[PDB]
């Protein structure tokens, strides 16, 4: 909708950022192509927009950077031999041929596992070239997940400079520099998990339940704006979302420029949090409306009861707008309780529904629906007290011992599930724990919700490929807002015939000692899996101890001269004295 | 102390066999276990084989199958069998007295070399 689209961009992003979104979109279309020659391709798209800068009536500068970008990947000598469908997606026309393409991006693409360098080679390449450091980061990560946001994979970046910046400059750097690379790395991963679950719960739950999510969350967020101003930006997040989730790069970063528009220019009627973020530049607007703390509660809100139960003309309003009605209830219910997490005031909405539908049909709805409310406490006070009772546990544990809590308790959930799946969810809630145990409590459940919704979503997918247990199939067979409860609501499996014992699977040997603290607690834990498998009757302090005696075998072996028979026969008195004590 | 006299060492050929003594010169009591360790031209020290308790047998992976180890306890001599030698194993080969709950190193031997040829 410019003169020249090419030069429009390149002014409005700058030098800085159109490098780099360059850059990432090509790493994301062409994936197997070595680093030096998606170096040389930006360097000749950057340079013809400075042409298009300088002069937009220039040759090339009046086409859309959609064709610009599409024949340039129809430049490379290899496309054909690299990429075989691809070559004949640039014979259509756009904007046929730009949908050809995202078809042909690979999710899983064959490509090396990314071994971190030592922290001395990492810094000395760092400053050897900042901007090539950086570059080879943006590219090693784009073409492992082309899906990813483009800007926000770009503001990763930024904290990942700001961190080699900061560490390496102080002695020891890496008590500095592995924590904030790990610390990332977990964040990056959730945050491409959770962009992907945004489109899929889109398309299979139904557009309705999505605006429904939104609802809660910007009445959370948005606590002093009206019903109808909080429904409308429900609608155009929901517009954003659906662009979003296509693919384009481009449509989705014009689609949240105008809804950062709109929101920026209408802050006193929606938030007084804002001044702030509305000063930010064109990719930082809409990434930092989305990260905006709640709004202030108005002041002496009335309750509930009066418009939802304490009203005569309440069922006739709810045949009257259903989806309506339900959402202003929703809207009034999530405004007052930044505290709860969405899926909470989801359950509590759905039971509201619940109820409605069956008491206006019977002979008085107004005294069938006036206790409602107290449906309502059951729901609340469970995930209160879950939170409550394990950042007690964290607090007392720290994270390693608390995994190996959580480890027990599932194993004994469902001991049908593969070792390597149970000791992943484990340590990822041990680490959400980590995460929002920090926060009062009035944060808490809206910090663990985002995370958990992905990390039982993981369980599933990865559940779905190989079904052994029917319980875990049950419990993913239900919404995202009763897939949590289930879990939960699961108890020890009483039917559940112990495996057999097998020796190598207990066995240890010196290699244990080399590996990092990461892996070598990794390994630990697999063995606790195993061995609750082994004895699911075990009690608590059984495992504890063996556990405790597992700490102290790895230990002393690995201080030893000779660690191999350290581990042959200290391992084989560990695993019959373990045995013998269990049974 | 004790000393330790390594004897059986020398050259050899590829898929040869080879038989290493290890006598000490004093009682090897209950306690220590007696073992092997070998050192590649340009590598470090590396375990071999061990045995303790007079039939626990632990051997290295690389000459798991190959190697075998055994004791004469009233002998106070440590054997190790080879037999299907390769070039890599190419090593000055030590034998050691160790103690039980530690496995901490006590006596080290001189060290007898063995090498391993192709027939060529
Ligand atoms: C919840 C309030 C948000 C207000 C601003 C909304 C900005 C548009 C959001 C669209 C998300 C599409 C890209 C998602 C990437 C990410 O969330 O990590
Ligand atoms: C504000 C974000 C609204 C997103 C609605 C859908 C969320 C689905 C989920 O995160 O699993």
Redesign the pocket.
């Given at each position: 909708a410019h003169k020249s689209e090419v030069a429009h961009r390149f002014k409005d992003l700058g030098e800085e950022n159109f490098k780099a979104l360059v850059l990432i979109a090509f790493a994301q279309y062409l994936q197997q192509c070595p680093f030096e020659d998606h170096v040389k391709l930006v360097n000749e798209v950057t340079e013809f927009a400075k042409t298009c800068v300088a002069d937009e009536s220039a040759e090339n500068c009046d086409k859309s950077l959609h064709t610009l970008f599409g024949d340039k990947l129809c430049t490379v000598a290899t496309l054909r031999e690299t990429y075989g469908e691809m070559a004949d997606c640039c014979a259509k026309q756009e904007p046929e041929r730009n949908e050809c393409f995202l078809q042909h991006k690979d999710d899983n693409p064959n490509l090396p596992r990314l071994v971190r360098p030592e922290v001395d080679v990492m810094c000395t390449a760092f400053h050897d070239n900042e901007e090539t450091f950086l570059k080879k980061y943006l590219y090693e990560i784009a073409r492992r997940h082309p899906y990813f946001?483009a800007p926000?994979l770009l503001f990763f970046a930024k904290r990942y400079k700001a961190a080699f910046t900061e560490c390496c400059q102080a002695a020891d750097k890496a008590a500095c520099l592995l924590p904030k690379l790990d610390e990332l790395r977990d964040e990056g991963k959730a945050?491409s998990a959770?962009?992907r679950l945004?489109c899929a719960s889109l398309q299979k739950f139904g557009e309705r339940a999505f605006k429904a999510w939104?609802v809660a969350?910007?009445s959370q967020?948005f606590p002093k704006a009206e019903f109808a101003e909080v429904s409308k930006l429900v609608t155009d997040?929901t517009k954003?979302?659906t662009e979003?989730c296509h693919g384009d790069l481009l449509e989705?970063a014009d689609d949240?420029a105008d809804?950062?528009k709109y929101?920026c220019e209408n802050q006193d009627s929606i938030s007084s949090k804002l001044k702030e973020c509305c000063e930010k530049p064109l990719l930082e607007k809409?990434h930092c409306?989305?990260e905006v703390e709640n709004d202030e509660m108005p002041a002496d809100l009335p309750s509930l009861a009066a418009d939802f139960v304490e009203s005569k003309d309440v069922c006739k309003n709810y045949a009257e707008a259903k989806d309506v009605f339900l959402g202003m209830f929703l809207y009034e219910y999530a405004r007052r309780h930044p505290d709860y997490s969405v899926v909470l005031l989801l359950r509590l909405a759905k039971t509201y529904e619940t109820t409605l539908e069956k008491c206006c049909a019977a002979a008085d709805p107004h005294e069938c629906y006036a206790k409602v409310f107290d449906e309502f406490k059951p729901l609340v006070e469970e995930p209160q007290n879950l939170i409550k009772q394990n950042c007690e546990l964290f607090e007392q544990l720290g994270e390693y011992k608390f995994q190996n809590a959580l480890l027990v308790r599932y194993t004994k959930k469902v001991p049908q599930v593969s070792t390597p799946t149970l000791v992943e969810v484990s340590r990822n809630l041990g680490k959400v724990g980590s995460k929002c145990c920090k926060h009062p409590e009035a944060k808490r459940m809206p910090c663990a919700e985002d995370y958990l919704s992905v990390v039982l979503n993981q369980l599933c997918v990865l559940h779905e490929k190989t079904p052994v247990s029917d319980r875990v199939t049950k419990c993913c067979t239900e919404s995202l807002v009763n897939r949590r409860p289930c879990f939960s609501a699961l108890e020890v499996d009483e039917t559940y015939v112990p495996k057999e014992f097998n020796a190598e699977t207990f066995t240890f040997h010196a290699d244990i000692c080399t590996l990092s603290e990461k892996e070598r607690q990794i390994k630990k834990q697999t063995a606790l899996v195993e061995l609750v498998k082994h004895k699911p009757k075990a009690t608590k302090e059984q495992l504890k101890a063996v556990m405790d005696d597992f700490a102290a075998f790895v230990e002393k072996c690995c201080k030893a001269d000779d660690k191999e028979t350290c581990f042959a026969e200290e391992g084989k008195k560990l695993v019959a004295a373990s045995q013998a004590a269990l049974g | 102390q004790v000393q330790l006299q390594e004897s059986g060492g020398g050259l050899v050929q590829a898929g040869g066999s080879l038989r290493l003594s290890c006598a000490a010169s004093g009682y090897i009591s209950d306690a220590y276990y007696m073992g092997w360790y070998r050192q590649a031209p340009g590598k470090e020290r590396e375990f071999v084989a061990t045995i303790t308790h007079g039939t626990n047998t632990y051997y290295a992976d690389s000459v798991k199958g190959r190697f075998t180890i055994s004791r004469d306890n009233a002998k106070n001599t440590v054997y190790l069998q080879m037999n299907s030698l390769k070039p890599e194993d190419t090593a000055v080969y030590y034998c050691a007295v160790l103690e039980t709950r530690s496995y901490s190193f006590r006596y080290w031997g001189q060290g007898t070399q063995v090498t391993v040829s192709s027939l060529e």
């Open positions: 946001y926000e945050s959770k962009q945004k939104a969350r910007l967020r997040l954003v979302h979003c989705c949240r809804l950062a929101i809409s409306i989305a | -």
